[PDB]
């Protein structure tokens, strides 16, 4: 039954009709009926035979199915494809999702349904035009597809059309009578999407088609989309469109020479001085209407320089390529706003390139900037930390110096991240909550490395008591990991990673200043992970007792002097003593373990196995609790 | 005579069938479908599906060959 089921399974994956021609044949009605439409798990993904046959796209077993059988054509199955898992699919919508015309003709002429949608209400016809095909999209459509029907995230059939650039397919959809002034929960109206992938073909046809030229939620037009990602053409395109009026022209203008200043795959400088001259000579085009550029506050970030007013200006910067890369951070984010999301990814790059000219002052001086723009939006920031991270220790790798105050405002967008991971892991249900849980790990591994250091550097009191305060205000938060590691636990445990890119060099764990800055800055000493060890366990469980016997220590002396109890017991009921597994390290603790006849007496009770609950009084309740 | 044994032999005939058949070793496939029908005396289920599923000159062989 099972096996035999599972082979049909593994027969019609790769569309072996004959051998389905005798395992599902010859046999009686009801003993096969539950065969036919019997869900098998494979590849992590479920599927009936029907499913991954159109999948396979293999027409002759979904015949056979379809004809010899009648199989039910409305079953319900998941998605390898499109990079993610998608459940609640169809027979019809895994066979438009790959191209495969003959089982799809087959599906709709043998009973399908057209308009069959998904858990993201993903219509057959948006996987179809999702592949690109336009046979098949004009014969669903031809069988009455209801090309208006949107998805969870309200991206119509045109839109993704229009991303994936297939021009024959969205000049078949705006051809029927489609919708080009659609919505997302973006506000991307088709044209943002088409000008953000840089097709050509697709913006002209949706001009051609009376589209709507109406600025999207994240406030930005399809000609500043286009302009944002220093697609010349597209601008080119968007710009003759008889309705941008001259504001918007020369907006777009500045904002594309902007946006090729500091692009990684666009760079190219003498672009944008040409692009930023040209929207200054259409400024400076009228004699009494000349459309004077909005003031700016110098920002500091930027070397305090200002945005260019007049063309005499810019002609003294055509040379200064280290100038040029402010002016157009500047005019980009005078133009997109603070508030965009596709801000702080220049400002980064121009960070990294000064770091890679061991330039690290004004990496720091942009990187600070883009990681605060990026924070006062609620979005992603583990890895901008974690570059941080990696300039700082780069920076004392190298025998430079860094910045005390840089060191303070790092760690405390660090503490803001950590609070802010912690109230997205405990609030996101099933959605991304191993993501989010590691990127909350990342963020903490990213602060002990900061912390790290901040203790190989030099700071001023005031900044070392700051440096302090955040790191109190962290924890008194008390972060936990997978495993229930706090920082201390990290930071005294060997088994911490550190990312291979410039960090090794300095963040080195178990680290004595770390341990000590946390012991004195006061950190729960006596914490226990889910596995029950304390510091002292994963210290004492430590493999270079001589290499770094300075490290271990002065680790063991500050664990011991802050009051961590050096007899505690974990999950396996083992002291530290025992766990310790290298002799050196067992000598170290034993002198610094002192006796205390409370704590005999304890393990006297955990061994005799007395009855000590409900007995003894409550805070005896927890200390014969953990000897 | 006809218990799962003889049914796995005939399954992996027809399965060399398909396989030699796409190859295009007819005469092969449609002696190895002999063979899988040889065994099993009244496989009316069988001799409706492969008169559709089956390419044409194949089946149109087979058939044939059958009274032989």
């Known amino acids: 039954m099972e096996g035999l089921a599972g082979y049909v399974y593994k027969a019609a994956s790769e569309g072996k009709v004959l051998t389905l021609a005798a395992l599902l044949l010859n046999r009686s009605e009801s003993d096969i009926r539950y065969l036919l439409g019997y869900v098998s798990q494979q590849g992590g993904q479920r599927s009936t035979p029907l499913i991954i046959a159109a999948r396979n796209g293999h027409a002759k077993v979904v015949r056979l199915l379809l004809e010899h059988y009648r199989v039910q054509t409305q079953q319900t199955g998941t998605v390898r494809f499109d990079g993610y898992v998608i459940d609640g699919a169809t027979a019809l919508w895994c066979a438009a999702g790959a191209g495969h015309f003959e089982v799809v003709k087959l599906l709709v002429s043998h009973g399908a349904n057209v308009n069959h949608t998904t858990v993201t209400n993903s219509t057959p016809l948006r996987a179809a035009c999702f592949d690109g095909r336009l046979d098949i999209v004009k014969y669903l459509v031809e069988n009455n597809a209801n090309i208006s029907i949107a998805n969870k995230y309200d991206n119509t059939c045109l839109m993704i059309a229009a991303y994936k650039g297939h021009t024959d397919v969205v000049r078949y959809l705006l051809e029927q009578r489609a919708d080009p002034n659609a919505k997302a929960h973006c506000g991307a109206t088709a044209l943002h999407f088409a000008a953000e992938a840089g097709h050509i073909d697709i913006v002209k046809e949706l001009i051609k088609w009376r589209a709507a030229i109406v600025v999207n939620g994240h406030g930005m037009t399809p000609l500043k989309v286009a302009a944002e990602s220093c697609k010349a053409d597209v601008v080119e395109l968007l710009l003759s469109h008889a309705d941008c009026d001259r504001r918007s022209r020369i907006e777009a203008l500045e904002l594309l020479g902007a946006s090729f200043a500091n692009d990684r795959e666009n760079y190219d400088i003498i672009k944008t001085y040409h692009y930023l001259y040209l929207a200054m000579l259409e400024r400076f085009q009228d004699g009494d209407n000349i459309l004077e550029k909005e003031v700016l506050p110098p920002i500091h970030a930027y070397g305090n320089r200002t945005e260019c007013r007049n063309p005499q200006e810019l002609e003294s910067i055509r040379q200064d390529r280290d100038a040029l890369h402010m002016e157009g951070l500047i005019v980009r984010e005078r133009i997109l706003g603070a508030d965009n999301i596709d801000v702080s990814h220049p400002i980064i790059y121009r960070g990294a390139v000064y770091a890679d000219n061991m330039e690290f002052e004004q990496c720091i001086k942009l990187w600070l900037h883009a990681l605060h723009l990026r924070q006062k939006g609620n979005r992603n920031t583990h890895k901008d930390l974690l570059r941080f991270a990696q300039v700082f220790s780069q920076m004392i790798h190298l025998n430079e110096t860094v910045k005390a105050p840089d060191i303070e405002c790092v760690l405390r967008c660090s503490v803001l991240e950590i609070e802010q991971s912690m109230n997205r892991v405990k609030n996101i249900s099933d959605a991304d909550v191993h993501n989010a849980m590691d990127n909350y790990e990342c963020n903490l591994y990213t602060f002990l490395y900061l912390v790290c250091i901040s203790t190989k550097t030099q700071c001023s009191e005031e900044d070392q008591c700051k440096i302090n305060k955040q790191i109190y205000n962290l924890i008194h938060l008390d972060p936990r990991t997978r495993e229930g590691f706090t920082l201390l636990h990290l930071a005294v445990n060997s088994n911490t990673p550190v990312d291979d890119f410039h960090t090794n060099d300095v963040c080195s764990f178990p680290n004595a200043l770390v341990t000590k800055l946390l012991l004195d800055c006061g950190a729960e000493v006596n914490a226990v992970d889910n596995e029950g060890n304390s510091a002292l366990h994963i210290i004492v469980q430590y493999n270079r007792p001589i290499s770094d016997f300075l490290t271990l220590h002065s680790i063991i002396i500050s664990l011991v002097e802050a009051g961590a109890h050096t007899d505690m017991t974990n999950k396996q009921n083992k002291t530290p003593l025992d766990k310790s597994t290298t002799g050196v390290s067992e000598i170290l603790l034993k002198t610094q373990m002192k006796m205390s006849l409370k704590c005999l007496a304890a393990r006297a009770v955990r061994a005799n196995d007395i009855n000590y609950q409900d007995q003894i009084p409550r805070t005896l309740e927890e200390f014969v609790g953990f000897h | ?68």
Do not use: R, S, W
């Open chain 2, 1 to 68: 005579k006809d218990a799962e044994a003889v049914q796995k032999f005939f399954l992996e005939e027809i399965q060399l069938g398909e396989e030699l058949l796409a190859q295009g070793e007819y005469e092969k496939g449609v002696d190895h479908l002999t063979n899988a029908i040889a065994v099993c005396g009244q496989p009316q289920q069988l001799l409706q599906v492969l008169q559709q599923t089956l390419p044409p000159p194949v089946f149109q062989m087979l058939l044939t060959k059958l009274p032989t």
